[model samples]
Target chain A: GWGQPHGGGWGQGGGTHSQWNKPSKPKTNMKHMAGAAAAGAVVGGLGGYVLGSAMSRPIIHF
Target chain B: GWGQPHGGGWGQGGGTHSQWNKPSKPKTNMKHMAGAAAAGAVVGGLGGYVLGSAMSRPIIHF
Candidate 1:
């Protein structure tokens, strides 16, 4: 839950576009995406659970 | 992609555990989790795409 870009700073920095567009050396490790997705899922799950549990009168499904 | 905890600040702030543990009012909006997950997915996808595309000699299989 760290290293996130601040408002207006994500894709605005210099060389941002070029960095992604340019071809570079291959990386052996492929954990970046997985790490981010995992973190996101964890946070989302927590938020959903906490918020859902606080609701009043659960709805009955057919 | 912003608003993430600054390393130690996450789950370490005073009253954090209590805040999360305590029952609170139901929120009308469930966008928080969805937003976080979406953002995470976007970043993760980008990272994966960029990193993957830069690899040498794609592996082919049936």
Candidate 2:
């Protein structure tokens, strides 16, 4: 098992987006998953709005 | 057949949190799921900060 470097390239959005299962706690799992997911809806719903707008013009670049 | 009212009370946080399987592209599924999930991690990671913080005090209420 590869131990992810602490506070490394990941989560640093200036770097890039990565995998899902990687974060969101793999070890001491709890309602943490729900917290990760539930709060996501609050944010994603808004951002995904711009998501569609951006996609409407350009599909993908990077 | 229930037509989810356009700009209805669902997204309106004034209402309440509901189910997961409901929104996030149900009918015409596509990379939309990835878009939904991917963008999710972005927001969740940050919010989960407060998540753990709030939990540190009271486990859960309401």
lDDT (Cα atoms) of all candidates against the true structure = 0.20, 0.21
Worst 10 residues of 2 chain B by lDDT: B49-58
- Write the residue-wise lDDT of candidate 2 on A1-62 in tens digits: 21111121111223222222222322321221222112222332212211110001112221
Off by over 4 Å in 1: A1-9, A16-38, A41-62, B1-4, B7-44, B48-62
Residue B24 accuracy (lDDT) in model 1? 31
Name the 10 consecutive residues with the lowest summed lDDT in model 1 chain B. B48-57
- Cα error, residue B35 of model 2, in Å, equals 17
**Against the true two-chain complex, what DockQ does each candidate achieve?**
0.04, 0.03
TM-score of chain B of 1: 0.15
lDDT of 2 at A60: 25
Q: What is the interface RMSD of candidate 1, in Å?
A: 22.1
lDDT of 1 by residue, A1-62 (tens): 22332122111222212112222332223222211111222221223111000111122222
TM-score for each of the candidates: 0.15, 0.15
